[PDB]
């Protein structure tokens with residue numbers, strides 16, 4: 001006698017478990033047990049993943065309902081699960097989106113100078129260097145401080161919330177509330193700070209005093225600050241870190257991109273496709289009875305959309321484990337999701353990785369792991385897969 | 395068909411696997427496979443563990459022989475496996491031992507003041523706090539700087555080697571050689587530095603110029619510095635960290651020790667007994683054919699002495715999972731080993747933990763985990779079991 005198949009399979013972000021392909025071939029939608037003890041439908045083929053993400057009756061918002069089967073415990077207030085919905089309803093979608101495009105004057109140059117400075121310091125200190133704690137994560141943090149319009153010096157303290165904020169836990173986390181309330185207070189103070197006139201918080205601060213936004217709550221304005229910092233920094237920091245592992249392990253690709261840096265955008269799109277940064281399927285709660293492949297999903301049930309299921313599906317991406325810069329469908333991956341909840345920071349995430357990789361290859365063309373790859377320590381029970389340290393030499 | 399049982403069982407240091415007791419009862423010496431692919435004899439009862447540790451024909455030195463079955467790859471030069479042997483042969487055993495006793499004038503007071511300062515800063519910053527990175531590890535580091543007689547400011551950089559130096563790896567680690575050579579250079583410089591006149595390095599520095607030690611190599615003198623810093627800091631830092639977890643999870647004991655701090659030494663001895671800080675059995679290579687229980691161990695074979703096997707053996711420590719302050723045999727545990735290779739820093743390790751715990755309970759009587767205990771991230775493929783962060787509130 002065995003127990004129901006449990007998720008997640010492995011916290012390692014350097015290889016995809018064989019079970020994924022076995023599941024996709026034989027049972028692309030199937031029952032599993034989450035860390036909370038709830039049952040869920042795990043969906044692992046490109047066709048069925050897209051079907052779920054494109055049908056709003058599979059609701060993100062409703063995952064926060066009391067009594068629902070849960071993937072993990074909330075680390076934010078239940079209303080914050082509908083964060084983008086709330087922003088849209090407040091008439092703030094356009095303003096937020098304009099504030100987070102990588103095409104802001106001087107922003108890409110700021111990224112370049114920042115990446116270059118970080119790398120110069122590592123070279124000066126000498127090998128080994130930690131490319132997560134001393135490159136990818138400070139770069140992500142520096143970027144989001146600039147995008148938000150908040151002091152660079154405040155970045156490290158806001159960052160220190162994230163190892164807890166993005167936990168994937170069976171039970172509520174007392175520290176998450178403490179940090180959340182503190183960070184919300186920080187952002188409420190930013191909105192009242194006359195020095196803060198640029199970036200996303202500068203724009204929110206002015207819209208807050210505009211009579212057309214008079215009935216938008218101060219709670220929402222502070223929430224947008226905390227949530228976009230946290231989601232942007234964890235996503236870009238983790239993606240860049242795991243992408244660098246994928247590159248370091250592919251010297252031929254590394255040499256090609258070094259030689260022809262104009263191929264970097266196509267390289268990053270493939271790195272996105274094969275990336276295992278997301279530790280759990282994307283959760284949705286059925287709000288009707290809906291047929292998904294061989295299964296009738298019932299109202300109230302939890303569905304988990306497995307991004308690497310879709311992104312490694314050989315029916316959509318032939319030879320899926322190989323980085324190939326000349327695919328006919330290169331942006332059709334699900335790394336940024338699909339449908340109603342498509343990542344609003346996708347352009348910014350792309351540019352973050354492109355510039356980070358550009359600068360690394362320029363400065364450290366001899367980059368290699370300083371420890372055997374099995375020695376990386378993979379963070380557990382977290383919403384992302386990431387090594388605690390990424391030791392490299394050059 | 396199944397493969398040979400693999401070690402280690404789990405990197406979690408907050409619970410002992412059920413398999414340990416099952417092994418001890420049914421097969422207290424049995425064949426296993428290590429991470430290198432080698433076979434070894436795993437020994438898990440108190441009686442057989444003591445037998446192996448007390449018989450020098452089970453050699454520590456010989457584990458470093460070329461072609462031997464290995465638990466893991468060397469992170470030090472092969473001659474350094476015989477470090478204490480080398481010290482003894484150089485006539486330096488007494489001098490080293492005298493230098494590392496916790497009874498040095500002002501040393502315990504330095505520990506108290508240091509622990510108190512660290513805790514005050516955490517209280518000032520506010521919850522949550524990380525008791526590994528911001529308490530146990532700086533306290534261990536501060537202590538060993540003082541014991542060695544080296545600047546407190548040099549501690550953090552020497553510490554940064556340890557996440558690699560004490561890896562338990564299948565293959566050699568390039569970063570370990572880089573850090574090793576650099577740290578050896580640092581210590582060679584300390585021996586020539588006229589400012590360094592106290593502690594272990596001050597004493598080695600004077601013995602180096604004494605004609606009775608004229609033919610002791612400079613290599614050995616620098617090696618003693620690097621090895622005692624590294625082993626002392628990793629062992630005390632890791633033990634204190636995991637001991638604090640054991641305490642936090644036992645509020646009744648925590649209250650008793652708070653109320654009657656004179657019981658702390660007896661508390662620490664039990665915390666040592668139940669501690670799971672050591673990630674692997676202690677390795678020994680047979681140099682003869684020797685009967686151990688039902689098995690004839692052959693010359694050249696690897697034997698792994700499982701400390702928690704012995705320390706949780708109900709035949710020697712009845713109700714072994716319970717901390718009981720009134721045992722008749724309280725120091726007969728194997729936390730510091732046994733025989734030829736008994737830990738030379740045992741008194742210092744005891745005092746480090748006693749003072750750290752004393753100060754914590756005084757300052758933070760309300761200490762508790764700030765995250766569910768399953769959320770701790772346990773370091774993998776390492777010679778110690780430790781959480782990457784220990785978030786607490788008070």
Ligand code: HEM
Pocket residue numbers: 060083084085100227228229231232233235236239277282283334335336337338340341342343344345346348349350
């Ligand atoms: C390469 C980096 C990034 C990756 C891989 C990524 C991935 C994703 C994915 C897969 C989703 C969809 C989740 C779902 O449908 O359940 C999402 C949504 C979201 N992301 Fe990103 N993201 C990245 C960067 C960013 C950045 C830079 C920001 C903001 C600065 C951001 C903020 C958000 C927000 C607020 C949502 C929720 C959207 C909604 O609910 O409609 N992300 N992200």
Ligand code: HEM
Pocket residue numbers: 454477478479494621622623625626627629630633671676677728729730731732734735736737738739740742743744
């Ligand atoms: C509570 C903290 C400590 C624990 C739990 C601990 C544990 C141990 C154990 C179990 C051994 C025996 C290994 C074997 O036989 O294979 C050992 C040996 C050793 N320890 Fe400790 N130790 C601690 C503190 C220290 C300190 C503070 C120092 C130095 C400052 C130190 C330096 C050494 C050295 C050099 C050896 C090798 C002894 C030999 O080969 O004869 N340890 N330790």
Ligand SMILES: O=C1N[C@@H](Cc2ccc(O)cc2)C(=O)N[C@H]1Cc1ccccc1
Pocket residue numbers: 075076080081082083084165166226227228230231
């Ligand atoms: O639940 C949500 N919360 C935030 C993201 C977020 C989560 C935790 C945190 O501490 C800060 C920010 C959101 O905007 N949208 C949704 C979905 C989401 C979760 C995680 C990352 C991105 C989106």
Ligand SMILES: O=C1N[C@@H](Cc2ccc(O)cc2)C(=O)N[C@H]1Cc1ccccc1
Pocket residue numbers: 469470474475476477478559560620621622624625
């Ligand atoms: O192999 C040894 N090396 C050192 C300990 C040591 C290991 C690694 C390092 O980077 C620094 C110090 C020793 O003294 N004795 C032996 C056994 C030992 C290993 C680990 C801890 C304690 C003792």
